[PDB]
Design a protein around this nucleic acid. Structure first.
Lengths: 562, 214, 112
RNA sequence: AUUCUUGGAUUUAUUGAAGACUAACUACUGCGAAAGCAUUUGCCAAGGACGUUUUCAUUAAUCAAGAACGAAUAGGGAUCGGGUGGUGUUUUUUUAAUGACCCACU
RNA sequence: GUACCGAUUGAAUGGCUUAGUGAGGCCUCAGGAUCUGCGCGGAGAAUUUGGACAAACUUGGUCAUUUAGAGGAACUAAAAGUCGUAACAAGUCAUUAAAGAAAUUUAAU
């Protein structure tokens, strides 16, 4: 029960509306820009102005409301124009008092958007009334100020509706956006009951939509979804310049939870994060504003998956972006959004368990960054190496039968490449970290003294040390000869998930379930600094080359630079 | 983030004939897509409501009625009588010290071949001007009590399908027939029916189902 | 007058379970329990935790449409304590304050 | 603290499976020589008290060795079963009656 | 980690090449799983003697460079590690009309 009135962008309460007993669910603003009435589950309508004057009780029907829209002579909800109901019914009223002029009963399914968008003339010489929000059909209603009404057509061309649009001039000859709950928005034609083109981007139910202040065939258009916005071209069909439905841009935001992060841009421009969403969002680093408007490429999210993403990585210049997910595959994406198939270099099939970690070799210019070193929960690790064409271009099968490296019983949680291509060590949940050679796939070393599984291991870029994290509140650092344990850091008040070095080989920066990030040094083995601006669990980390900006990961979508 | 409660069908329950008002209540089903259509999916939901809440007669606040779904038609679905049960508060109200608990069970077929097993509860009362504090049975009269109930229950079943038997269970006509016959042995108190449940419904059979409908 | 359901309060020891269902009892909604609303692994049947979870359970049910509901109180049953739990009285008092309806309630303790 | 858990734990609705036992009634009551004996129903014998104007005629009693089975003086009140009596009631708008009850006697 | 001397000419590639290896289609003597048609043809799979053209594959040596590089002599890094030694510094109230059931709006004094 909160329907509160504000003023200019200070935001102070002018008056508080909590008077009616049912919880207010819907509300819209006015073309007079001064009056506001809210929809609720008791069919309770209260016309209020802001000075404040909260006028005459309108009470003539029950039910519930889930859509509302106004008019310049009938300035109320869909309780006056028509009736927002849970069974579907059109009720005829007026701006004059609570008499009932005419009544109209046609629906058998629930519908609340009976006059979800106006007909601006209310005489309809060539105009129409459009309606639907729950009944999953589109009906074409007449308007009669004194007689019963007629249905013009019905449209069973949809399977689910939530909101209806209508051309501003009202003829309907031009584009008409209809947003349905079936992850589908369409361009329809009112006088003929036919679609122009249907557009299928999302995998989620469309929310309700209001109006744009634009005229006819518009200039831009905005589509609403889950923590993302997208701008669409305005033809979608051979109207002015182009057809065969396309998307102009898809501006990305931020998700609450984050698993991993990796710098994409070669001058440390772009960051790509892996979330619970099955998409690739690239906002964060160059955008010191809110949502993305300043990344120097075509801003567009990627999708080639069916489940969530587990770990993601790229090389130095950022031309190959290899990612890992739960759909048992490995997909590498290109920097500047070009390929031969869609934007995918190749999708690699052959994993018998979930693909929980992914990694690249060191950069040269080609070859090694053309390759792929991915990991799966099938107690193995898989290297895809085809050198004779340019690799990461085609579907590669080189390690599926017995070329895979299998000596594990609990799953490997991470993997790291040395600055040379010779050795690489992966950490695993069975309290050990193993060094294997990349040229052969033979067990080079077995490093273990722990009390919990090892979620992250990484090398120093001077390849003199080794950094690994275990859930016994300690971060351990090893020699390059594996004949002597070098250093054992303790002081973290809980478990450490991920540890990493700085690019000047100065500091060990750690991230765990503490609630604060810690920067120890790799030189004296003491605490150089700790940083405390979090209260959630820390899961990922990334280091720039310069050492001033350090980005961290939280559980609520907060990225803190230091 | 899916929010399935903008996707579920809102749906209602229609009741059979020999009752009071056929409006019952609501459910929530699914969105009728192809491959999971909503009609053929469930077909067997179970409604368990006190009959006093539907009959209106407030001297029936125990003895809840179990229902079973058969047919569905488009914001209507029709249900069938599956079981009848007492509340736990009702029989545990009854069981007093210094008296004898007599039960009976019988497996008996209806006219249309619904096989149903009912139970029975019987309690001993004191007469007027009793002196003794218990008034038990004789352990052979209990044989004479279980046998009279057993032959009466087989007579009333297999006749005029279960709705009329439901039309006898509601005003509990059965209890007076138990009462008068078995009184010559030993008088009695509270006797009720306490359960009926079914396990051998023959067939789908829409033909006799629509004869109760208006 | 209203649209109905059953609340089925299972007040065990060291936890309290509340979940409202449909009229049939196969369809669930708002399953949120008392142990969720504090983290000490000790006050999982404390009444302020019971009043906390009953508010959020009545929150989502008021946001879908259910306004009237039966309760079916239930102890652990069988060879257990057969006793209504700590967070049963205030929790029934918590959701009745939220703006719902309470009528014709009974007991589903398995008392064998 | 141990354990289980998104291949969904716990809760919820529908089933099937396995083993186990007769919950309030259940008593200072009954049965059995004791150890022991609680769902309905059927069968197979065994036992006690009562009643008896039936029958044998001292056929009796108590207990080392030994075997089966089991670790191995005279009143009072209430109650159980049977029998007798009734200036008796109740079920009987059914003619009878079985049966419960009230009181006495043993 | 970088520059140098130096054995292995190891592995990659380049120049030359002994040696062995060799796709593919063309023709013709023989052959028939199979075809719309007033004695049977258009069409058509396997197998087959001989003859011309033929790309190219595998490996060994000579020489250079990279990598791996035993061993030999520097620079830088690690201010680093232990021990010893030396001096400095540091705690819009009221009454009252109009609309509005209620709030609220407006007027009056």
């Amino acid at each position: 029960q909160l329907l509160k009135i504000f003023h200019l962008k200070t935001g102070k309460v002018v008056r508080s509306m909590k008077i009616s007993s049912p919880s207010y669910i819907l509300d819209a603003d006015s073309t007079s820009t001064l009056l506001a009435v809210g929809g609720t589950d008791g069919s309770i309508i209260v016309v209020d102005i802001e000075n404040g004057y909260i006028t005459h009780s309108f009470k003539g029907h029950g039910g519930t409301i889930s859509s509302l829209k106004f008019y310049g002579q009938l300035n109320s909800k869909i309780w006056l124009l028509a009736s927002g109901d849970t069974n579907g019914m059109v009720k005829v009223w007026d701006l004059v008092k609570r008499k009932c002029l005419h009544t109209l009963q046609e629906h058998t399914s629930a519908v609340r958007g009976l006059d979800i968008i106006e007909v601006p003339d209310n005489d309809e010489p060539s105009l129409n009334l459009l309606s639907g929000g729950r009944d999953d059909i589109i009906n074409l209603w007449d308007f009669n100020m004194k007689k019963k009404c007629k249905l013009l057509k019905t449209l069973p061309v949809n399977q689910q509706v939530e909101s209806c649009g209508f051309l501003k001039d009202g003829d309907g000859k031009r584009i008409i956006y209809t947003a349905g709950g079936d992850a589908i928005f369409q361009l329809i034609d009112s006088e003929s009951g036919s679609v122009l083109k249907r557009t299928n981007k999302p995998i989620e139910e469309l929310f309700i939509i209001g109006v744009l202040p634009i005229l006819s065939n518009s200039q831009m258009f905005l589509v609403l979804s889950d923590q993302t916005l997208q701008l669409i071209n305005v033809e979608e069909d051979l109207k002015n310049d182009e057809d065969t439905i396309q998307v102009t841009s898809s501006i990305a935001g931020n998700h609450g939870i984050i698993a991993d992060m990796r710098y994409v841009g070669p001058e440390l421009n772009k960051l790509a994060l892996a979330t619970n969403s099955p998409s690739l969002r690239i906002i964060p680093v160059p955008d010191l504003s809110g949502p993305e408007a300043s990344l120097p490429l075509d801003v567009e999210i990627y999708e080639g998956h069916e489940d969530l993403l587990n770990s993601l990585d790229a090389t130095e210049d950022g031309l190959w972006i290899a990612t890992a997910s739960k759909d048992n595959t490995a997909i590498v994406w290109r920097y500047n959004e070009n390929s031969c198939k869609f934007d995918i270099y190749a999708k690699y099939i052959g994993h018998s368990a979930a693909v929980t970690a992914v990694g690249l070799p060191n950069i040269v210019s080609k070859g090694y960054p053309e390759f792929l070193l991915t990991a799966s929960n099938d107690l193995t690790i898989k290297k895809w190496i085809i050198p004779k064409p340019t690799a990461s271009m085609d579907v590669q099968i080189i390690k599926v039968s017995e070329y895979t490296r299998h000596a594990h019983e609990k799953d490997i949680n991470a993997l790291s490449v040395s600055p040379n291509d010779s050795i690489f060590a992966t950490a695993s949940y069975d309290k050990t970290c193993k060094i294997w050679n990349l040229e052969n796939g033979e067990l080079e070393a077995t490093l273990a003294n722990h009390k919990r599984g090892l979620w992250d291991v990484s090398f120093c870029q001077y390849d003199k040390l080794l950094a690994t994290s275990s859930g016994d509140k300690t971060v351990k650092i090893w020699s390059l000869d594996t004949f002597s344990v070098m250093k054992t850091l303790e002081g973290h008040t809980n478990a450490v998930q991920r540890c990493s070095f700085i690019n000047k080989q100065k500091q060990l920066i750690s991230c765990g379930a503490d609630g604060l990030i810690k920067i120890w040094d790799c030189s004296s083995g003491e605490c150089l600094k700790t940083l405390d601006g979090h209260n959630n669990r820390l899961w990922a980390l990334s280091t720039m080359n310069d050492g001033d900006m350090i980005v961290s990961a939280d559980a609520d979508g907060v990225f803190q630079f230091w | 983030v899916v929010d399935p409660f903008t996707r579920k069908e809102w749906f209602d329950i229609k009741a059979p004939s020999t009752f009071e008002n056929r409006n019952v209540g609501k459910t929530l089903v699914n969105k009728s897509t192809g491959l999971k259509s909503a009609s053929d999916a469930l077909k067997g939901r179970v409604v368990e409501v006190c009959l006093a809440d539907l009959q209106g007669s407030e001297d029936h606040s125990f003895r809840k009625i179990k229902l079973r779904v058969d047919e569905v038609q488009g914001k209507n679905l029709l249900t069938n009588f599956h079981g009848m049960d007492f509340t736990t508060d009702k029989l545990r109200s009854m069981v007093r010290k210094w008296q004898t608990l007599i039960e009976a069970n019988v497996t008996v077929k209806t006219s249309d071949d619904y096989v149903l097993r009912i139970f029975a509860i019987a309690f001993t009362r004191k007469q007027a001007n009793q002196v003794k504090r218990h008034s038990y049975a004789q352990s052979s009269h209990i044989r004479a009590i279980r046998k009279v109930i057993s032959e009466i229950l087989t007579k009333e079943v297999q006749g005029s399908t279960l709705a009329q038997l439901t039309s006898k269970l509601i005003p509990e006509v059965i209890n007076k027939e138990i009462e008068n016959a078995t009184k010559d042995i030993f008088p009695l108190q509270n006797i009720h029916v306490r359960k009926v449940k079914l396990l051998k419904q023959p067939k789908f059979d829409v033909g006799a189902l629509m004869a109760l409908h208006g | 007058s209203q649209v109905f359901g059953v609340a089925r309060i299972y007040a065990s020891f060291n936890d309290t379970f509340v979940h409202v269902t449909d009229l049939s009892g196969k369809e669930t909604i708002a399953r949120v329990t008392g142990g969720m609303k504090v983290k000490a692994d000790r006050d999982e049947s404390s009444p302020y935790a019971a009043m906390l979870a009953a508010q959020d359970v009545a929150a989502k049910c008021k946001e879908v449409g259910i306004t009237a509901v039966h309760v079916k109180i239930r102890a652990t049953g069988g060879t257990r304590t057969k006793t209504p739990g700590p967070g049963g009285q205030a929790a029934l008092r918590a959701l009745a304050r939220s703006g719902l309806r309470i009528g014709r309630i009974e007991d589903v303790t398995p008392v064998p």
